[PDB]
């Protein structure tokens, strides 16, 4: 299963996916690391190496296992009343400006259809959808 994934991300033929693609692959296989957590295991390089160096599935397996060793409490922080809802506009703002910033498009993709007519998201059901 892990092999069928690694091969699909090689877009050249050298039996190797790019360094910047390593996070994308771990997430494809069901892991949820932060950008800094993947940048730890991959040497913490500069902008030169991220868009150049390449690694094989043999040298990539000890990274996938390294990352593989609640989420509801994250959402509950932006629930200002404790009432099971968060404002989608506040969630769009913080996801695009705080932490490991996401683009407008990425957030718009995951949030579309989950906002009610008062601008609220019922986050227990949203969390189960994104798991």
């Amino acid at each position: 299963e892990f092999k069928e994934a690694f091969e699909l991300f090689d877009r050249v033929g050298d039996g190797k996916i790019l360094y910047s693609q390593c996070g994308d692959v771990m997430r494809a296989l069901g892991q949820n690391p932060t950008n800094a957590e993947v940048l730890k295991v991959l040497g913490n390089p500069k902008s030169d190496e991220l868009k150049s160096r390449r690694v094989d599935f043999e040298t990539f397996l000890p990274m996938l296992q390294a990352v593989a060793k609640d989420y509801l409490e994250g959402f509950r922080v932006f629930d200002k009343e404790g009432n099971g809802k968060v404002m989608g506009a506040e969630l769009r703002h913080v996801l695009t400006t705080l932490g490991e910033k996401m683009t407008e498009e990425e957030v718009e993709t995951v949030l579309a259809g989950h906002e009610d007519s008062n601008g609220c998201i019922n986050y227990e059901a949203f969390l189960k959808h994104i798991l």
Binding site: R27, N32, E73, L91
Partner: protein, 752 residues
């Protein structure tokens, strides 16, 4: 002092010789126990900055740029000296704003440029508005005093302070102008025009060009503006202090005598002044010493016209005005009287000496008699009296003493007659008093003059410090937080050293009544009584003729030389008796109908008695450069002046107390995110208490009031930091989950 705020990218202020403070930025987190900080400057790249142990303190944190330059300092994150300096400087240089509120005081920085903010339109704009709804302005202070007078049913005072050239007199005149406009006409008596006309009279006789100010006030003034029961102006009464008598007979280079002498000499060719036999200002010894007969932009002849018009408005008849000018011209001619020495202990005035002849005509006295008593003294042992000749040097000094005495008594006569013209027949219902007096001063050489000024300033500072304390105590008492947590600066030990029994002034008076008493024996008396026995008194290490007082603003070394003579202020009685006996000149005898230190102590006590029964309003004027340059600011001189008016200490106290004050509702609303659901009770106040005790373990850092939590410096900033941390971590948890989901969807798409 919260070390957790000193993270990478955090901006601080560190010392700098040229601008007092300079900005720096952390290139690394401070870890507890670190001996240095890693900093980037503006110029010179990086720096290893040593933190002094024992007194383990980190450098002051910079406020975010967005919070800088507001009309007051109430929304700053960090309150300290660099923040105040920076806020004032930015407002002044970048925005040409000279007025700013700092706590309860208005700070006014002299622009040395005419600004279009004082017209009648602006007076009307401030009338009937709340101070908080308007930009800072001297008119806002005047308006708040006017309104508080009626609302509290109490009298008020406006106290304006600062160095020479800072803007005290300009500020005081704008305050008076404001009152005259918004509370005018109690009748057709034109009361306000008369109160305002006192200004040019007092400036002509009491102001002079010094090196620091072309229009320096050489006296202090308290003017009590009286209001009737409908709060309309009905008149005023003026008291004066510390007239610089020495200026009548001496000027340093570039300085002038009092303005009126130059107004008179510039008018020498007027027909009405023929009998004054006046030369130009370079002709008289008493006006020529500075080599500066003219002030740039002042026409002395035209000012004389204004002075006479003002005198007429205040009811000084043409003949009393001519009398004033006769006496002033007499003083000038007296200064040109020369003595020829006969031997080491005797002198004489030359035959047919024109300056004396003219003096005696002007004063209505006999040449023979005046000549004799200018060159002889009457002494008096217990048994009998006798007459001795005096040396040329002693004759010269006695002649100058007479000139000073004449002028000081003429000055007092004019003030008295101004007061008569401004007197209301019906007793005032209330008043607003305006005080414009010398700020704290120290030079390389300090003498009796500086000592009296700095004494007055300790008393005025004490009123200020106690007013601030009383206001603070009231805030703590309303919140049921112990008022014994409040600090204040105590001027009383300095005051006792100056004015109490066995103190400096008492010892001076006692030495003055001893025949053999001198500056040298007085100095030894000071040492015997106070050296090693009063922490505020020191002796210089290389002098036996000086003493040091630790005043509120700085230590000041005073030279003893001349203290006894200045305290005594002796004038030869026989010389005065000649003037008093003038037979056909009505004004002159009217001028002559305790030591200086004792009289000053009494008059200062009477001023403070008046002021202590008012609510004071403070204006702190700052002279931003020493050269009268338009909008030019020097940081070192600015900080010096903020110290000398008590502002830096006030700010230090506020910052070190409990400056952050939040309702429980405000606290709960902002920091709910820091709370576990289990700790949230229906009682929100009880929740905040329980939670805060867990978030900040040191109970020194906050106090629980009836409606508010009081926090020491840095505590809200720390809570803001951990709040941001909480939001950041929660946001990252959501982000990583969404990134995982997005990639699982993309991977299913490429699979298919």
């Amino acid at each position: 002092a919260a070390s957790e705020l000193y993270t990478k990218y955090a901006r601080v202020w560190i010392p700098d010789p040229e601008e007092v403070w300079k900005s720096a930025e952390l290139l690394k987190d401070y870890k507890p126990g670190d001996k240095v900080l890693q900093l980037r400057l503006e110029e010179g790249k990086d720096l290893e900055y040593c933190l002094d142990p024992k007194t383990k303190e980190l450098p002051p944190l910079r406020n975010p740029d967005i919070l800088v330059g507001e009309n007051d300092l109430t929304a700053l994150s960090y309150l300290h000296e660099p923040a105040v300096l920076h806020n004032l400087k930015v407002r002044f240089i970048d925005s040409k704003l000279i007025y700013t509120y700092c706590g309860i005081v208005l700070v006014a920085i002299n622009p040395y440029e005419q600004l279009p903010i004082y017209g009648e339109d602006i007076i009307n704009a401030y009338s009937g508005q709340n101070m908080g709804d308007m930009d800072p302005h001297i008119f806002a202070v005047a308006e708040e005093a006017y309104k508080q007078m009626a609302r509290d049913e109490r009298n008020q005072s406006i106290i304006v302070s600062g160095e020479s050239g800072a803007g005290k007199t300009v500020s005081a005149k704008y305050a008076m102008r404001y009152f005259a406009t918004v509370s005018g006409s109690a009748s057709e008596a034109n009361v306000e025009e008369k109160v305002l006309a006192s200004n040019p009279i007092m400036e002509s006789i009491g102001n002079a060009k010094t090196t620091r100010n072309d229009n320096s006030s050489r006296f202090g003034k308290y003017i009590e503006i009286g209001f009737d029961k409908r709060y309309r102006i009905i008149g005023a009464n003026m008291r004066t202090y510390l007239l610089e008598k020495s200026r009548v007979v001496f000027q340093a280079e570039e300085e002038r005598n009092y303005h009126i002498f130059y107004q008179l000499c510039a008018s020498a060719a007027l027909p009405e002044f023929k009998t004054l036999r006046l030369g130009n200002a370079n002709y008289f010894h008493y006006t020529k010493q500075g080599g500066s007969p003219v002030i740039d932009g002042i026409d002395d002849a035209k000012e004389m016209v204004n002075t006479r018009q003002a005198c007429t408005l205040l009811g000084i008849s043409d003949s009393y005005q001519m009398g004033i000018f006769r006496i002033l011209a007499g003083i000038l001619h007296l200064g040109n009287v020369e003595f020829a020495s006969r031997d080491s202990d005797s002198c004489a005035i030359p035959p047919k000496h024109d300056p004396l002849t003219i003096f005696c005509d002007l004063m209505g006295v006999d040449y023979e008699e005046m000549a004799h008593w200018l060159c002889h003294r009457k002494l008096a042992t217990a048994t009998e009296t006798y007459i001795k000749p005096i040396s040329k040097l002693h004759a010269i000094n006695a002649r100058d003493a007479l000139a000073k005495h004449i002028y000081a008594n003429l000055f007092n006569w004019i003030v008295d007659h101004v007061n008569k013209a401004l007197h209301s027949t019906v007793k005032q219902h209330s008043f607003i008093g305006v005080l414009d007096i010398y700020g704290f001063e120290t030079f390389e050489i300090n003498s009796f003059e500086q000592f009296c000024i700095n004494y007055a300033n300790e008393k005025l500072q004490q009123q200020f410090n106690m007013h601030v304390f009383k206001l603070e105590q009231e805030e703590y008492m309303k919140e049921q937080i112990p008022w014994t947590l409040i600090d204040f600066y105590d001027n009383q030990p300095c005051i006792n050293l100056i004015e109490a029994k066995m103190g400096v002034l008492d010892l001076l008076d006692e030495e003055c009544k001893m025949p053999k008493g001198s500056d040298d024996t007085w100095a030894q008396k000071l040492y015997n009584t106070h050296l090693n026995k009063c922490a505020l008194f020191e002796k210089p290490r290389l002098s036996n003729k000086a003493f040091i007082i630790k005043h509120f603003a700085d230590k000041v070394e005073y030279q003893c030389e001349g203290f006894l003579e200045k305290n005594k202020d002796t004038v030869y009685e026989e010389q005065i008796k000649v003037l008093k006996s003038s037979k056909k000149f009505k004004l002159l005898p009217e001028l002559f109908q305790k030591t200086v230190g004792h009289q000053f102590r009494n008059s200062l006590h009477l001023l403070m008695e008046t002021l202590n029964a008012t609510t004071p309003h403070y204006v702190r004027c700052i002279k931003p450069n020493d050269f009268k340059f338009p909008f030019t600011f020097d940081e070192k001189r600015a900080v010096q002046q903020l110290r000398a008016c008590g502002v830096l200490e006030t700010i230090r106290i506020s910052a070190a107390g409990f400056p952050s004050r939040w309702t429980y509702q405000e606290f709960f609303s902002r920091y709910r995110v820091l709370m576990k659901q289990k700790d949230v009770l229906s009682d929100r106040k009880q929740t905040c208490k329980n939670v805060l005790e867990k978030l900040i373990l040191d109970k020194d850092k906050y106090q629980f009031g009836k409606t508010k939590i009081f926090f020491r410096a840095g505590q809200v900033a720390y809570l803001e930091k951990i709040r941001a941390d909480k939001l950041r971590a929660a946001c990252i948890r959501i982000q990583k989950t969404i990134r995982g989901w997005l990639m699982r969807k993309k991977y299913m798409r490429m699979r298919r």
